[PDB]
Amino acid sequence: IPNTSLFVPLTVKPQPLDKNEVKKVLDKFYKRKEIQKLGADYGLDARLFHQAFISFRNYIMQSHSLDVDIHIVLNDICFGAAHADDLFPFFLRHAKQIFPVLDCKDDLRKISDLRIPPNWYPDARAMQRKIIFHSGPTNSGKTYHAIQKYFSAKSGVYCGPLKLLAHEIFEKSNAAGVPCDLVTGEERVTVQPNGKQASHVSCTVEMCSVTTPYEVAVIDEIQMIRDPARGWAWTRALLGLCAEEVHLCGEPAAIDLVMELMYTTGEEVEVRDYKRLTPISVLDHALESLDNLRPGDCIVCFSKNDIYSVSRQIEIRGLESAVIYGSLPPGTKLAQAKKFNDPNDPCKILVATDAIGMGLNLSIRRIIFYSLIKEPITTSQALQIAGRAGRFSSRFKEGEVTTMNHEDLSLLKEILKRPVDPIRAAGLHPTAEQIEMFAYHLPDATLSNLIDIFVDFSQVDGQYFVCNMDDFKFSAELIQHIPLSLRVRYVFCTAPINKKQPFVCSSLLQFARQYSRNEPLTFAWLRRYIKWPLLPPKNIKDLMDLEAVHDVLDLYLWLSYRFMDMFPDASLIRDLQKELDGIIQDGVHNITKLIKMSETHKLLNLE
Ligand SMILES: Nc1ncnc2c1ncn2[C@@H]1O[C@H](COP(=O)(O)OP(=O)(O)NP(=O)(O)O)[C@@H](O)[C@H]1O
Ligand SMILES: [Cl-]
Numbered sequence: 001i002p003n004t005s006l007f008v009p010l011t012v013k014p015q016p017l018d019k020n021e022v023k024k025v026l027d028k029f030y031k032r033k034e035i036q037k038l039g040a041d042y043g044l045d046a047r048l049f050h051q052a053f054i055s056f057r058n059y060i061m062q063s064h065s066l067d068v069d070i071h072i073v074l075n076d077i078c079f080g081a082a083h084a085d086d087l088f089p090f091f092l093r094h095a096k097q098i099f100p101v102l103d104c105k106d107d108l109r110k111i112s113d114l115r116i117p118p119n120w121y122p123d124a125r126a127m128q129r130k131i132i133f134h135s136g137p138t139n140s141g142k143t144y145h146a147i148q149k150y151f152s153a154k155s156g157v158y159c160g161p162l163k164l165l166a167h168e169i170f171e172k173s174n175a176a177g178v179p180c181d182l183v184t185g186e187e188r189v190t191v192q193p194n195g196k197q198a199s200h201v202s203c204t205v206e207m208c209s210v211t212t213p214y215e216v217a218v219i220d221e222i223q224m225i226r227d228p229a230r231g232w233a234w235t236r237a238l239l240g241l242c243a244e245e246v247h248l249c250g251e252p253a254a255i256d257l258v259m260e261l262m263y264t265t266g267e268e269v270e271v272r273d274y275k276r277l278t279p280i281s282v283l284d285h286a287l288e289s290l291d292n293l294r295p296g297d298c299i300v301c302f303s304k305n306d307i308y309s310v311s312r313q314i315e316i317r318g319l320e321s322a323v324i325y326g327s328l329p330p331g332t333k334l335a336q337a338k339k340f341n342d343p344n345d346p347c348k349i350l351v352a353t354d355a356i357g358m359g360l361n362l363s364i365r366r367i368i369f370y371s372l373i374k375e376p377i378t379t380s381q382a383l384q385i386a387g388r389a390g391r392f393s394s395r396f397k398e399g400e401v402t403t404m405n406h407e408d409l410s411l412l413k414e415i416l417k418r419p420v421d422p423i424r425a426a427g428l429h430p431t432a433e434q435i436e437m438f439a440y441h442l443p444d445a446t447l448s449n450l451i452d453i454f455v456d457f458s459q460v461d462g463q464y465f466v467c468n469m470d471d472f473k474f475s476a477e478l479i480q481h482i483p484l485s486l487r488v489r490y491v492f493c494t495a496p497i498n499k500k501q502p503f504v505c506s507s508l509l510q511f512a513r514q515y516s517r518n519e520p521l522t523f524a525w526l527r528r529y530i531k532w533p534l535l536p537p538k539n540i541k542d543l544m545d546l547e548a549v550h551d552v553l554d555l556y557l558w559l560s561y562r563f564m565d566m567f568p569d570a571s572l573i574r575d576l577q578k579e580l581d582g583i584i585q586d587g588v589h590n591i592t593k594l595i596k597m598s599e600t601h602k603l604l605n606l607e
């Protein structure tokens with residue numbers, strides 16, 4: 001069972017015998033089928049047996065001094081007083097220092113046993129919870145029902161997939177006369193001047209508390225429970241929120257799994273179905289040509305190159321367009337959204353990625369898929385994107401959907417109507433405590449190696465899977481040379497970073513390094529580090545750089561809530577970040593000039 005390729009051999013350096021005879025004894029020992037078979041009984045397969053033997057022979061041949069007990073046995077084997085198999089217990093103890101996993105396999109199994117996840121949440125197990133799955137398309141009112149139920153409860157928590165949604169529900173709750181706190185990875189707002197927690201809170205799903213009683217919880221986008229990297233946060237909220245009613249919102253493809261899980265907790269599931277609030281239809285004609293653009297059009301693109309090329313093509317036609325993509329800061333996304341939505345603003349076309357699928361209220365008359373390749377978009381993605389046309393909360397009473405090119409149109413019709421398979425399993429991840437206990441057993445393993453050994457030893461029930469830890473392992477490998485305690489290193493490797501931006505990676509090293517030296521990262525120090533003041537961008541690469549500085553400031557903020565004394569200046573950094581969002585916001589308003597500079601001065605080819 002255990003994958004022995006994951007074991008990185010530790011070095012055991014060398015500390016009267018005939019060394020030529022001993023070698024002969026060693027070489028025969030290695031070759032005895034009996035000895036190899038006894039090796040395998042103890043977990044030494046061919047590779048471990050081999051690697052332990054190489055170092056064992058090495059240690060014996062090169063040590064100036066052996067322990068007395070092994071010395072005597074070698075003397076006695078050489079001189080006929082002992083059988084050669086008597087060397088085996090020494091070889092085994094040697095192997096166990098080369099490969100300490102061989103000394104604690106049962107222990108590691110127990111530590112990484114992830115079966116019966118609900119037992120991890122004794123507070124939720126200790127009370128009745130009823131699960132209500134509000135199932136339906138986007139724009140069906142499934143979310144509105146859950147959220148109103150939340151607004152009317154004496155206490156409640158909303159858990160969303162996106163920071164923008166946590167903000168939005170926090171703003172709506174307070175505007176509706178319901179005191180509501182905000183908890184995201186980067187921000188905590190306590191609205192009550194008494195500093196006490198409000199009885200409603202709006203959070204990103206990873207930040208929800210599983211030890212706080214609530215009358216009502218809402219878990220938005222429940223199907224993200226199968227997300228390969230993030231699904232674990234949805235499993236944790238679904239199994240662990242101590243709410244009398246747990247309201248779920250999402251697609252019907254998540255229902256069967258939810259029922260399998262809630263069967264294991266003995267909790268009732270009530271499904272409530274919703275239909276689209278307004279009409280929607282797919283057209284018989286492609287857009288075919290950008291000449292055919294009309295106010296309220298949204299062209300959805302699957303690469304940033306298409307975003308640039310399309311927004312510039314639109315400009316050269318004498319039209320303005322708004323731009324939305326995932327890595328924009330949130331004040332920019334909102335400012336672009338507001339220009340596009342304002343009927344009296346002549347900017348009336350939106351060029352956006354699939355980031356518009358959730359978290360922004362957009363008044364879109366017609367979705368035009370620019371292409372259908374991201375590999376083709378999935379039925380779920382298409383339906384989420386499509387359904388953004390004609391939202392009940394917009395002035396468009398009906399929605400339209402089409403593609404740009406005519407060949408794509410029946411492919412789109414086909415994708416949209418194709419049945420979606422039930423999702424099959426819920427994500428789990430190793431906790432900080434589990435990895436810290438692994439590290440006590442295997443204190444010389446690197447953290448990225450411990451994660452792989454944990455995953456390999458772990459056991460899960462049929463309805464779960466262990467989430468991907470590639471991001472976490474990339475950070476671990478980046479900071480592996482910095483001295484940090486296990487629990488601190490774990491937190492640093494969980495900070496969410498875009499590993500494709502060198503300045504973000506350089507910043508994580510810098511923050512980890514200063515932490516390790518007890519050197520607080522102050523506002524003044526950070527301001528010089530990012531070379532403030534930063535200037536308006538002149539081209540796309542300048543914009544990308546600003547966005548990368550904005551993410552570094554997010555990294556500082558994320559860390560400040562885990563390490564307050566070493567990142568003590570969060571308010572001041574937030575202020576600086578808001579000035580940087582303003583600069584990026586003006587640059588994005590002017591994005592067609594940045595793009596024109598990139599193409600015409602930098603000669604970048606956008607297609
Ligand atoms: N009864 C109602 N009165 C006023 N507005 C409503 C009502 N029902 C729904 N809405 C609005 O119509 C839009 C769609 O509702 P709903 O489908 O519950 O939300 P949604 O934003 O599409 N969910 P998502 O797919 O997660 O973005 C939202 O702006 C709602 O706040
Ligand atoms: Cl490490």
Ligand code: NA
Pocket residue numbers: 311320321322323588589590591592
């Ligand atoms: Na524009």
